[PDB]
Amino acid sequence: TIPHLAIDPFSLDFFDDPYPDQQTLRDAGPVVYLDKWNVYGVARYAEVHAVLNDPTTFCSSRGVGLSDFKKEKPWRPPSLILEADPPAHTRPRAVLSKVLSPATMKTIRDGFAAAADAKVDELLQRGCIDAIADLAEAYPLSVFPDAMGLKQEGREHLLPYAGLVANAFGPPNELRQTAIERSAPHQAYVNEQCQRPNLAPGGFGACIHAFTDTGEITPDEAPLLVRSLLSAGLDTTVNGIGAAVYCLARFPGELQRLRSDPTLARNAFEEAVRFESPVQTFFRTTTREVELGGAVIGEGEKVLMFLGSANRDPRRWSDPDLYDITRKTSGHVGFGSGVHMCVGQLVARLEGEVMLSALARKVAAIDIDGPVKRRFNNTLRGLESLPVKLTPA
Ligand code: HEM
Ligand SMILES: COc1ccc(C(=O)O)cc1
Ligand SMILES: [Cl-]
Known part of the structure; x- marks a missing residue:
């Protein structure tokens, strides 16, 4: 009934160009079985969206990577939000929602925007820059650690720790083994910064x-919730901003439209998140036998969701392989969908919007002028190096 495929969605050849294999996964059927890792897969928008929005059946508390926490010990203590189900998920989620609230965004927006404008101004003085290290990384590093309240020392551990977490969702391949081998100094730094004395006032x-006195979380849960923000709060924003710059460099007609109307900045970033989906995949685990796409999936099975493929599914999107900054992006699953939908999405969107706004106002052309290098990670898509020449407006 359900087709079996040998595609390894965590192989370097797949990361190098995933789009043809994602069509093969979509067109084989609504539900596929991936023999390489003994998991079910869903790559169309409909089933990805359905799975995300049925957390009682497709749970997260047995892990959202390949490993099933009922069979193996997690490599680090489970996230109190990502790796929890309702009702235990609910109040920690509320605390993070309020910490990263619209009111919080209003408090920090002017400073985030000034730092974006300053970065672009600085980059325009140099002309030829690396849009990853010098822009996509440098700008989030210039605002988010300070907004966290982190001290200056040790911040070089943030991006490595985050890449470790993302690689550890994947299967036990070399990317995952090497990440865990290198983890100890990054993990020691991150866990220490999670303690209350080490987080600056107001951040x-x-x-x-x-927020540890309301009956929502206890003091001993706060370090792990800080850990969630330190795990997730940087590298996908980096990849999303780098993707937007890549898109504006590859599709100059869209940079021309953005320049003509800088209020398209927010949707231009949202479209970049759909187009390059910084998080490519997440897993769920079935808690019961369930019918999905005509398939009967037993209890205790891993289900791999292809978010990036769902965001390029022609069943849901017109011209999904085009970058369109005026596209109606609502409903894309680059931030997930449902009760776990990215609690930090307002932070990422704020950073992406104000960076693209600075570019829209200050830059006339973005020309790739060197070899583009890909960054490989079991669950993240992004670039390692993006040499560009920036021409001032
Ligand atoms: C473009 C940037 C980002 C992308 C593409 C992204 C992607 C995602 C996705 C797809 C999920 C859903 C997880 C699931 O369904 O199992 C998620 C959840 C989450 N994200 Fe993000 N994220 C981004 C930025 C951020 C930022 C900036 C933060 C923190 C400031 C953050 C923190 C979290 C947390 C804590 C969760 C777990 C929420 C829950 O389980 O209820 N993310 N993210
Ligand atoms: C990749 O997205 C996430 C989301 C949450 C966490 C976490 O809660 O630690 C880590 C990565
Ligand atoms: Cl850890």
């Missing part, structure tokens, strides 16, 4: 620790 971390 995201301090506000989590201040």
Whole structure:
């Protein structure tokens, strides 16, 4: 009934160009079986969206990577939000929602925007820059650790720790083995910064620790909730901003439209998230026998969701392989969907919007002028190097 495929969605050849294999996964059927890892797969928008929005059947508390926490010990203590189901998910989620609230975004937006404008101004003085290291990485590193309340020392551990977490969702391949081998110094830094004395007043971390008296979370849960923001709060924003710059460099007609109307900045970033989906995949585990796409999936099975493929599914999107900054992006699953939908999405969108706004106002052309290098990770898509020449407006 359900087709079996030998495609390894965690192989370097797949990461190098995933789009043809994603069509093969979509067109084989609504539900596929991936013999390489003994998991079910869904690559069309409909089933990906359905799975995301049925958390009681497709649970997260047995892990959202390949490993099933009922069979293997997690490599680190489970996230209290990502790797929890309702009802235990619910109140920690509320605390993170309030810490990263619209009111919080309003407090920090002017400073985030000034830092974006300053970065672009600085980059225009140099002309030829690496849009990853010098822009997509440098800008989030210039705002988010300070907004967390982190000290200056040790911040070089943030991106490595985040890449470790993302690689550890994958199967036990070399990317995962090597990440875990190298983990100890990054993990030691991150866990220490999660303690209350180490988070500056008013920042995201301090506000989590201040939220420990309402009956929603306890003081001993605050360090792991800070850990969630330190795990997730940087590298996908980096990849999304780098993707937007890549798209504006590859599709100059869209940079021309963005320049003509800088209010398209927010949707231009949202479209970049759909187009390049910084998080390519997440898993769920079935809690019961379930019918999905005409298939009967037993209890205790891993289901791999292809978010990036769902965001390029022609069953859902017109011209899905075109970058269109005026596209109606609502409903894309680059941030997930449902109760786990990215609690930090307002932070990522704020950073992406104000960076693209600075580019829209200050830059006339973005020309690739060197070899583009891909960054490989079991669950993240992104670039390692993006040499561009920036021409001032
Ligand atoms: C473009 C940037 C980002 C992308 C593409 C992204 C992607 C995602 C996705 C797809 C999920 C759903 C997980 C699931 O369904 O199992 C998620 C959840 C989450 N994200 Fe993000 N994210 C981004 C930025 C951020 C930022 C900036 C933060 C923190 C400031 C963050 C923190 C979290 C957390 C804590 C969760 C777990 C929420 C829950 O389980 O209820 N993310 N993210
Ligand atoms: C990749 O997205 C996430 C989301 C949450 C967490 C976490 O809660 O630690 C890590 C990565
Ligand atoms: Cl850890």
